[PDB]
């Protein structure tokens, strides 16, 4: 319920990740990944990251993964390797649905899950901070500083992107 709503979105995020990480068909893996891409935005939205949340929709859901479909349409291994095609992918998918189900139950009971880090299984809502942001959206003012203080990053990010296009055509030119 809405008590632990962000508990939910985080959960489909994990199962969405287990989807493509289980190495299913690249389109199906794309389907599982974009599902995780879709649900992950809600996690950021719940924290007030509307601008950041909307971007991953734009340049990662409607961005990177669209051209991924081209290579899948270009690869086209002679038979679909959808989940029914192989049995290891089922085992990979089935497995990846266990331990995260195990530790949430581990975290829901006593909350003292010590996997690598100590972790609290308390409700997602707690770690939020109380305080008005006035009229300036904190997310917006942070990003807009791109052109105020992020001068140095802008040059390096731009220069690499320019070098990004010079390499891509050069490697793909095939001599």
């Amino acid at each position: 319920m809405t008590m632990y709503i962000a508990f939910i979105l985080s959960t489909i995020f994990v199962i969405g990740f287990v989807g493509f990480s289980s190495k299913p068909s690249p389109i199906y893996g794309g389907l599982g990944l974009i599902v995780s891409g879709g649900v992950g935005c809600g996690i950021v939205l719940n924290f007030g990251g509307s601008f950041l949340g909307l971007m991953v929709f734009l340049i990662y859901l409607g961005g990177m993964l669209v051209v991924f479909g081209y290579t899948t349409a270009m690869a086209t291994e002679m038979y679909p390797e959808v989940w029914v095609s192989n049995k290891t992918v089922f085992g990979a998918f089935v497995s990846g649905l266990m331990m995260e189900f195990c530790m949430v139950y581990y975290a829901l009971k006593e909350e003292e899950v010590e996997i690598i880090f100590k972790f609290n299984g308390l409700g997602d809502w707690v770690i939020y901070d109380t305080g008005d942001s006035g009229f300036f959206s904190e997310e917006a003012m942070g990003i807009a500083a791109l052109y105020s203080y992020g001068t140095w990053l802008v040059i390096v990010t731009g220069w690499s992107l320019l070098i990004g296009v010079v390499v891509i055509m050069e490697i793909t030119r095939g001599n």
Binding site: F51, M64, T76, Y147, S148, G164, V165, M169
Partner: protein, 115 residues
């Protein structure tokens, strides 16, 4: 509360609308009916082959181009900064480099993709 509720309503509306478009018409498909249509003639076995480079080349250029435009969404709030001169110079830089990437891509064939 309302946002995914609005998202929820549309998906059910779509799913039932195809559901009563699927079970209602009393599906009566045969083997030849479900056979692929290829201009009325025999398919020779295909749709599993690579397609050169032009479709891939434009996709990557679009992806790279989409990434730079991603860098320049925050401009409407950027104009509200205190130091416009730095912001004016910096935003102009992204656009001219966006131009330069297009400029090189144009000059070295590029957008005239392979055939």
């Amino acid at each position: 509360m309302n946002i995914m509720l609005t998202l929820l309503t549309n998906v059910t509306l779509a799913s039932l609308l195809v559901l009563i478009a699927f079970w209602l018409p009393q599906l009566n498909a045969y083997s030849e009916k479900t056979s692929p249509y290829e201009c009325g003639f025999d398919p020779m076995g295909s749709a599993r082959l690579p397609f050169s480079m032009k479709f891939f080349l434009v996709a990557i250029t679009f992806l790279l181009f989409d990434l730079e435009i991603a860098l320049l969404l925050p401009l409407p709030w950027a104009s509200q900064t205190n130091n416009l001169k730095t912001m004016l110079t910096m935003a102009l830089f992204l656009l001219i480099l966006l131009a330069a990437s297009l400029a090189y891509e144009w000059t070295q064939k590029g957008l005239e993709w392979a055939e």
